[PDB]
């Protein structure tokens, strides 16, 4: 008997005012939020943001939409959402968001006999997430999604997570290329602007970057090259060709490491720890080359001086390199 | 009572002519602006603009919307904004702007018993900002946002900042990885076009570019390469291949220093500071190579002159490079 349902729905929407929230002027209307994360697409250090797709469900109660005699969850067409009051929920820290619209607008309206309304959307949002890259690539990031009411204050609307810590699901299934999600957290609070106090929900993920490949790629080769640069100290100065070959090899390897690192790193124009470490290693090999040049210039007239400076360099280069590594470890690790 | 409020609003909107501004045919309507800056997402030199996200609030008074009997301020659903009169405010120097629309259109309408209307939007705008890069990377930019009325002259509308110097807030939320906010300024004036005089507001920021990245990436490598090019003067001139290879390597490496960062700049016709420093270093290394070529040319006939030239170069080159650095860093800092 679709005629009875049609009559009931027409009666519900007859005289309905979409400009007035439920219980207008009375106690605030409570909205419960559920989020199902379909996927986190990409995390960008260049743009300081991340893209995230989700099913976003809001649950509330409107006494105007109460019907009796129909023992069913009335699942209506999504266009009915244009004839009802819905919360003005928005994401505070987003840059570009949209609701999917193929094949129709991705939206669900479900009414319940007591007047309860369930309103679901499928949203893909790019959200800002400032990152601290000083300790790159040991950095650990914390990216948030902020949910807030735009127009209504805490005197009119209230937010809460439906089901508590079970409100957000599907985080465990997310796989990212660079990062691995460690822990997510849900927070509910109030935020005061000059226009008043608004409810606020926060969903935050803590991301730890994968570190093995970088360590095997940029730190170990640099350390090995700096160690190899000291072999020429033990080489006697009679065979200058071997020392020239060693210097050329070390410089070529350092340049190759630097170019590959430039290729790997995002092009964010600000300082990072790995850049300083590579610069220090290059300065060390450059100093070794200059010391060899000084030995070559001196050895012909004063062989004792050249032997002495080589012998002293043999002990003062590893000590200085170890001191630099200790300073780097304390300052950035 | 919800029905009483609904009938009050219906009576307010009955006979309301949207096509006519408040006080049509009479004194101009005064509109006050507030801006709350959320973030400046990016500042592009290539495209010569900057992206800015803000809360834009407009405050005015319409006697047609005055209501009595309700000691409340009516926060209405944003859709009612489609049925009221709002100022035709536009931004003169914006290239692509939009109002965020997830989950609903980020718009706010609030009415007061006096008839005063508060209208709020959340807007992301990409505003053009022409830049003078003659002192790059030690430059300092000044980016403005211009706010104007399109269809209404100073006889129909007036603009002012609500709160004076406190009209714009949230400047401390701006976090540019490459710049730093130095000062923000508010201006109010009139602009005369062929169709009349229009009110104009202006919000201007002054940006100071960070230097550490360029010191680590450009200046230090250039100085190191220039210093390494001086090792040629401490090598016996009989080793022609070694000195020639060192000179050629230094010249070619100096020609290819800022290639990575010179592909994110516009094709400007003038010389920046970094270009001048690189050209100076190139001149130094080229002169070192020419000095060796001359020494090799006069090596056989008069070895004493060649030795004297090398000895004098050993002192002249570092001193002149130090003087060049002194003059450069005094002029540009």
């Amino acid at each position, epitope marked *: 008997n679709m005629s009875f349902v049609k009559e009931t729905v027409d009666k519900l929407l007859k005289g309905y005012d979409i400009r007035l929230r439920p219980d207008f002027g009375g106690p605030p209307v409570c909205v419960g939020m559920n989020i199902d994360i379909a996927s986190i697409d990409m995390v960008s250090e260049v743009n300081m943001d991340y893209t995230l797709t989700m099913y976003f469900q809001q649950y509330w109660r409107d006494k105007r939409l109460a019907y009796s005699g129909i023992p069913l969850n009335l699942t209506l067409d999504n266009r009915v959402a244009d004839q009802l009051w819905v919360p003005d929920t928005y994401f*505070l*820290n987003d840059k570009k968001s949209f609701v999917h619209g193929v094949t129709v607008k991705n939206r669900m309206i479900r009414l319940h006999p007591d007047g309860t309304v369930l309103y679901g959307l499928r949203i893909t949002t790019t959200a800002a997430c*400032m990152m*601290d890259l000083r300790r790159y690539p040991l950095d650990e990031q*914390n990216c*948030t999604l*902020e949910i807030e009411s735009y127009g209504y204050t805490t005197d009119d609307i209230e937010f809460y997570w439906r089901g508590g810590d079970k409100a957000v699901t599907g985080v465990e299934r997310i796989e990212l290329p660079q990062f691995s999600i460690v822990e997510h957290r849900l927070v509910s609070r*109030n*935020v*005061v*602007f*000059a226009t008043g*106090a*608004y409810p606020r929900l*926060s969903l935050s993920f803590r991301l730890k970057r994968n570190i093995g490949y970088f360590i095997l790629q940029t730190y170990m080769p640099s350390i090995l090259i700096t160690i190899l640069s000291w072999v020429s100290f033990w080489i006697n100065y009679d065979a200058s060709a071997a020392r020239v070959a060693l210097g050329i090899t070390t410089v070529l390897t350092m340049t190759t490491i630097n170019t590959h690192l430039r290729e790997t790193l995002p092009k964010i124009p600000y300082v990072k720890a790995i850049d300083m470490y590579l610069m220090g290693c290059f300065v060390f090999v450059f100093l070794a080359l200059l010391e060899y040049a000084f030995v070559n210039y001196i050895f012909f007239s004063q062989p004792a001086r050249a032997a002495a400076i080589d012998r002293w360099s043999r002990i003062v280069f590893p000590f200085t390199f170890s001191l630099f590594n200790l300073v780097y470890w304390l300052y950035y690790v | 009572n919800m029905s009483f409020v609904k009938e009050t609003v219906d009576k307010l909107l009955k006979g309301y002519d949207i096509r006519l501004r408040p006080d049509f045919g009479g004194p101009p309507v005064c509109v006050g602006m507030n801006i709350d800056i959320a973030s400046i997402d990016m500042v592009s030199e290539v495209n010569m603009d900057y992206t800015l996200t803000m809360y834009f609030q407009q405050y005015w008074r319409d006697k047609r919307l005055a209501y009595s009997g309700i000691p409340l301020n009516l926060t209405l659903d944003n859709r009612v904004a489609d049925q009221l009169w709002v100022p035709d405010t536009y931004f003169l120097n914006d290239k692509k702007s939009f109002v965020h629309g997830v989950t609903v259109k980020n718009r706010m309408i609030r009415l007061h018993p006096d008839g005063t209307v508060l209208y709020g939007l959340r807007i992301t705008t990409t505003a053009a900002c022409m830049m003078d890069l003659r002192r790059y990377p030690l430059d300092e930019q000044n980016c403005t946002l211009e706010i104007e009325s399109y269809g209404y002259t100073t006889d129909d509308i007036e603009f002012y900042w609500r709160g004076g110097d406190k009209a714009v*807030t949230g*400047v*401390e*939320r*701006i*976090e540019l990885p490459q710049f*730093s*906010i130095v000062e923000h300024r508010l201006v109010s004036r009139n602009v005369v076009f062929a169709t009349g005089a229009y009110p104009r507001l202006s919000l201007s920021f002054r940006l100071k570019r960070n230097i550490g990245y360029f010191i680590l990436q450009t200046y230090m490598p250039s100085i190191l390469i220039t210093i390494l090019s001086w090792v040629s003067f401490w090598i016996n001139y009989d080793a022609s291949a070694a000195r020639v290879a060192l000179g050629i390597t230094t010249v070619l490496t100096m020609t290819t220093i800022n290639t990575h960062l010179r592909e994110t700049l516009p094709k400007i016709p003038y010389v920046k500071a970094i270009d001048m420093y690189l050209m100076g270093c190139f001149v130094f290394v080229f002169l070192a190579l020419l000095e060796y070529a001359f020494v090799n040319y006069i090596f056989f006939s008069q070895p004493a002159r060649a030795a004297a030239i090398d000895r004098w170069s050993r002192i002249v080159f570092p001193f002149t490079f130090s003087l060049f650095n002194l003059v450069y860093w005094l002029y540009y800092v």
Partner: nanobody
Amino acid sequence: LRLSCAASGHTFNYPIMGWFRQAPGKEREFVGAISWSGGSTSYADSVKDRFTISRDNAKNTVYLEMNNLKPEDTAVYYCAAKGRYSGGLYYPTNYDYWGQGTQVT
């Protein structure tokens, strides 16, 4: 005089430091705020040109210097940290971590 607020821990997630003072018979009042990194300061109208605020990230410290003090400045001071999306700057509610209460006459 001069007061120093030193912060330790996850100071990146709270890039704004603020100063508040509570009168013996009144509520907490905003004084000043400073970005941790940007070095931009905001002051209340009652203490403009008399107080100054600076910051140094070498040891994660922020300095509030008081000049031309007046007897009506007898309040207990507090240094607080504010999140990146905590909202307004002049409201004590938005600040999460509060420093030690300091009494200055």
